[PDB]
Structure formats: structure tokens, C-alpha cells
Design a protein around this ligand. Sequence first.
Ligand code: HEM
Ligand code: HEM
Ligand code: HEM
Ligand code: HEM
Lengths: 141, 141, 146, 146
Amino acid sequence: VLSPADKTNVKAAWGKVGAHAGEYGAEALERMFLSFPTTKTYFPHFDLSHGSAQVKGLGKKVADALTNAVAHVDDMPNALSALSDLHAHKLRVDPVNFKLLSHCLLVTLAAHLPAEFTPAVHASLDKFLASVSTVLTSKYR
Amino acid sequence: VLSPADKTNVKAAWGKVGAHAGEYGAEALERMFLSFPTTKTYFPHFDLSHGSAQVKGLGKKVADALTNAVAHVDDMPNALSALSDLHAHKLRVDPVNFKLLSHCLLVTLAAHLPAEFTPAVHASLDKFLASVSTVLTSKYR
Amino acid sequence: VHLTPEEKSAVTALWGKVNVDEVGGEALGRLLVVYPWTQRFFESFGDLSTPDAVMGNPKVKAHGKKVLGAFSDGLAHLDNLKGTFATLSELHCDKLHVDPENFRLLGNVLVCVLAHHFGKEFTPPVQAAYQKVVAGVANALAHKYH
Amino acid sequence: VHLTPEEKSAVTALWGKVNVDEVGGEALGRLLVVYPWTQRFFESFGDLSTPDAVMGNPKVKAHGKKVLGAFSDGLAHLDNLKGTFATLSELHCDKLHVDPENFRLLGNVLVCVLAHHFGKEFTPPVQAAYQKVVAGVANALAHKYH
Ligand code: HEM
Ligand code: HEM
Ligand code: HEM
Ligand code: HEM
């Protein structure tokens, strides 16, 4: 469960990210593809090179989904339902991969939030991304 | 989530366990210690030799906990509240290990329930043990 | 990883009792039922609408035979799984785009199938040996990913 | 399980800028805050009641220094991590009873701390090199478990 403090922390951090969200989403995907090459198995139709417009485009959508989740932190399952459907029944990304993108999102946030990424905020963001991952995989079976 | 069909499947399968609950719990633990030796790091205080009273006793308690959960499958968080407290606040077993015991419980059931371990029941049991694991780790942070 | 001599002997002894085609069809079928996201590779295989449809699907059974046949042959090379499966690894990465986690799920299902098939003969130590084997094979199949 | 030439270079270059004492205290502290169940190994360390208490805890800082110091020594032996960490591996299993998953969690927190501290210089390629390293060290520390 996300505590009131977790929710406050997530909104603070994501708020500072602000208009950079899409850039950070693309950066997180790039970090994932490089650190965890098996994740590239889901993207044979993408050019995954640095600066790829396909990665930038996906990065913006991932970031917008997270913005929406933050905006609906008390009602996340409904906000993300269409995305839960899409991952469970079309994309069918093995659930293990969500922890890999979550880690890379954390790392991206850490690399861009010198002031905000305190230990407490790091903890809250990790819980938050784990919660989003759980929602995104909730309809897999 | 456990579908209504999952719940029917689990109640039928676990009902067959009956008086073997203790035996199967202890066997699942032994399977885990042998297959996944890192799990023994949580039991330096046990005689883990085959047939040990400590392993038999824990096996019985694990099984009765599962019985409790099956009987209250509609509200497992409340049914397992004390146990989720115990694991989160005291035992503090890393969440990765729950998958390992779950797999060993599943193997134990397969080995003992030739008639009842159909593909559909296998799926339902796997989901159920995953849900129990989720409840048991729900208070960790 | 690594197997003791007694463990290798246990693995070989049990496997000599296995109907590879049947166990292969049963494991792949169960993989698609228990972990349905694994169906993503098999849209061309026809009816996967229910557990009975998956288990009875002749294309699912055919692929099960193919996969477990390769697994079976690999058991003759327990001391060189990476070498044995290198070319298949490259194929599964470069052309088939199979996330190696799939190999691990299949291993889990195979262990459950062996337990179901063999009952009490699938003792805790025998399981431990097979866990090393399926981990070794998954690791070997994953090794050439890039 | 091998770094490229550029990857080793990237690892060594960044590490030249790391205050191992400071980064070690920070990484261990964050481990105990982010994954508070890991406090199970530090019952005697005093106040771990709040994030500020954990981060300022002199025993957490001191132990972080020792842990990351040993990590740092290992970066001189990237081709021989198993041998380099064998003695500590046995210690962590036989005497300390530490689940090796903890090594993985600490690796993840360390990568986060390097990102936080170094910012843009911690590029995606540099991170990828460090991910290989922390996985390698964790696997080395886990290798003598039984
Ligand atoms: C926080 C976790 C995640 C979020 C919030 C997220 C969100 C999204 C969104 C918003 C889309 C676009 C959907 C559309 O265009 O209709 C998408 C597509 C996609 N995602 Fe996820 N995702 C997550 C995790 C992952 C992971 C871990 C993987 C694989 C490693 C993955 C693989 C994909 C793929 C392959 C697509 C389709 C891309 C395309 O072909 O255009 N996702 N995701
Ligand atoms: C299905 C998952 C699990 C269930 C249902 C379960 C249930 C239980 C129960 C009922 C007890 C006894 C509580 C008491 O006596 O007050 C217990 C204790 C314990 N469990 Fe869990 N457990 C699970 C998973 C795990 C796992 C995966 C581990 C570690 C690998 C673990 C480690 C322990 C330990 C160390 C104790 C204390 C034993 C003792 O010293 O008496 N548990 N568990
Ligand atoms: C022990 C594990 C496995 C082994 C030994 C294995 C082996 C093989 C072999 C020998 C082939 C034929 C290659 C060729 O035609 O050149 C193949 C193809 C294939 N495999 Fe794997 N496999 C394994 C696991 C998996 C899993 C778990 C999946 C997906 C869930 C998978 C997906 C596929 C697909 C989609 C093909 C192509 C099938 C076709 O074109 O009809 N494999 N595999
Ligand atoms: C790269 C990973 C790690 C390395 C290289 C490492 C290394 C070391 C070293 C060198 C010592 C002895 C320090 C001394 O000289 O007094 C030690 C002790 C210890 N380590 Fe590890 N460590 C690592 C990770 C961990 C983690 C993640 C945990 C638990 C979460 C842990 C638990 C402990 C404990 C409980 C002690 C004894 C502390 C005491 O004396 O009270 N270690 N480790």
C-alpha cells in the first residue's frame, strides 16, 4: 500500500520532472535496453539505437501513463486498465521485465533530481513503480 | 485475482490434501531446502535433516495457514493478518523466496494428487500460492 | 550446476522412463495454460481458446515434441550445455525474439509435469537434480543473447 | 558475464571519482531505507527508526565503508570475481546467514546512488557496465553457498 507520505513524495518528484517526463521515459527505455538486453526481445520492429524516434515516442507514452497514474494514485487500477489489457493480452511482456524498467526509471529520476531524490523519496518511488507494475500485470491470467 | 473458478479449483484440490496437510507442508519445505539452498539462510537455527521435528512442525503450520486461506479465500488479507505481520516485521524473509516455496508446494501437490492436478487446476493453484505470497509480503514496506 | 555424479545418474535414470513426445506436448500445453502470455509466439497455431483446446492442439503438441526432443538430446551433454545450445540460443534471440524468462517458466512446468507423471519417485533429491538441469539449459539457451 | 573494453574503461574511470567511504555509507543506508526488511541483519546497529536515523547512523556508515571497500578491491579483479570473493562468500553463507538476494538489492541501490551523485555523467552505457559489475559481484558472493 502507498502511504500518504509515499503519495506526497511521488507527486513532489514527478512534479519536478514536469515537462521533462517524455524525455525521461525515453532515457529509461534506453537504459533498460542497454543494461538488460533480453528486454529488446519485445522490440524487433524498433530501431533501438540512441536517439531513435521510436524509442522517444514510446518514452513519451510511458511517461504520460505514469503522469496519469500519479494523477490517479488512489484509483490506479481503473486509470491503467486499458494498458493492463494491452500488456496482458496483446504485448504479453513477461512480468519479470516490469522490475527492469522500474529500476531504470528510478535510475533516470535519480540522475535528474539531485535535490529531490532523497532516501525517503527513492523508497516511495520504488513502491510506486512496483504498484504500477502490479496493476499492469494484474490481468495476465 | 483469483477467479471464482480458481476458488472452486483450489477448494477441491486442497480438500483432497486433508489429513496430509502436515506431511505435504514438510515435504515442500524439504524440496525447497534441497532445490534452493539459499533458502536455508533463514533456518540456521533448525535441524534441517530429513524427518526433523522442527521441519515437520513448521510444515504443519504452513499447511494449516494454507487451509485457513482456502477457507477464507474471499478475504485472505484478514485471514492471514497475523502471519503477514510476522513475516513483515520479524522474520523479514526476502520476498523472492516466496516464489521458491510456492513452486515447491506446487511440485508436492503434483506428486501427490495425480487425479486432481489437471492443467486448469495447476494454473489455479499457482495463482493461489502467488496470491498468498502477495498477502504475506503486503506489509513489508 | 554443477551436478554430482549421483545426481547425473538420477537424472539419466528417470529420463530413461520418459515418453519425450508426450511429456513435451504436456509441458508446452501446460506452459500456455498456466502462463498464458507465452501464447504470444503461437498465434499461428489455431485454437488456444480453453485449456482443453490448448492441450489437444496438434500444433502445440508438435512444438512440444520439437522442444523437448532438443532438451532430451541435450541431456547427453550436461558438461557442455552452453556449447550444445549456442546455435539455438542465437536463433531464439536473433530470429525468434523469445525472452529467456520463457525458458525458465518452461523448466518450472517440466518439473511439475515430471512430479505429476512420476509421483513419489520424483523425490526431493531427484527434483533438486532436475532443478539444476533446467536452470542449466535455460542459462545455456540465454547465453548468446545480446 | 564479460565487460567490453569500453565497459571496463567506463567502470574504472567513474570509480576514480568515487569516495568509497561516503558512497558505501550512502548505499548501505539506502538499502535499509528502501528495503527495510534488510535491517534484519543489523539488529545491533542502534537507531534505524527513520530514514534520517538510518542515514546518520555511525554503525551503518562504518559498515558501508567496509562493504564497499571490499567491493572496490574487487574492481581490480573483474576477470576473477569468483576467486576474489570466495572467502567472503563462505563467510556470508556459513557465519552470517545472509540470503544472496541481498547482494542484488545492494547492487541496485548502489547503481541508484551513482546515478544520483554523478547525474548526467552516469550515462546509459556507463550504467550498463555497472549493471554487469554488480551482477558479477553478487554472483561471486553467492557462489560458495550450499
Ligand atoms: C511502468 C511500466 C510500463 C508502462 C507505464 C508502460 C506503458 C506503455 C504505453 C503507454 C504504451 C503505448 C500503448 C499504445 O500505444 O496504445 C506501451 C506499449 C508497449 N510496451 Fe509498455 N509499459 C510499461 C512496461 C513495459 C515493459 C517492461 C516492456 C518490455 C520490456 C514493455 C513493452 C511494450 C511494448 C513492446 C509496447 C508496444 C510498442 C509499439 O510496438 O509501438 N512495456 N507501454
Ligand atoms: C506459502 C508461503 C508461506 C506460508 C503460508 C508461511 C507460513 C508460516 C507459518 C504459519 C509460520 C509459523 C508462525 C508461528 O509459529 O507463529 C511460519 C514461520 C516461519 N517462516 Fe513462513 N510461510 C511462508 C513462506 C516462507 C518462506 C518462503 C520462508 C523462507 C524461505 C519462510 C520462513 C519462515 C521462518 C524462518 C519461520 C520461523 C520458523 C521458526 O523459527 O519457528 N516462510 N511461516
Ligand atoms: C528447453 C527449452 C527449449 C528448447 C530446447 C527449444 C528448442 C527449439 C528448437 C530445436 C526449435 C527448432 C529450431 C529450428 O527450426 O531451427 C525451436 C523453435 C522455436 N522455439 Fe524453442 N525451445 C525451447 C523453449 C522455447 C520456449 C519456452 C518458447 C516460447 C514460449 C520457444 C519458442 C520457439 C518458437 C516460437 C520456435 C519456432 C517454431 C516454428 O517456427 O514452428 N522455445 N525451439
Ligand atoms: C558487494 C556486497 C557485499 C560485500 C563485498 C560485503 C563485504 C563484507 C565485509 C568485508 C564484511 C566484514 C567487515 C569487517 O571487516 O568487519 C561484511 C560483513 C557483514 N555483512 Fe557483507 N558485504 C556485502 C553485502 C552485504 C549485504 C547486502 C548484507 C545484508 C543486507 C550484508 C551483511 C553483512 C553482515 C550482517 C556482516 C557482519 C556485520 C557485523 O559484524 O555486525 N553484506 N561484509
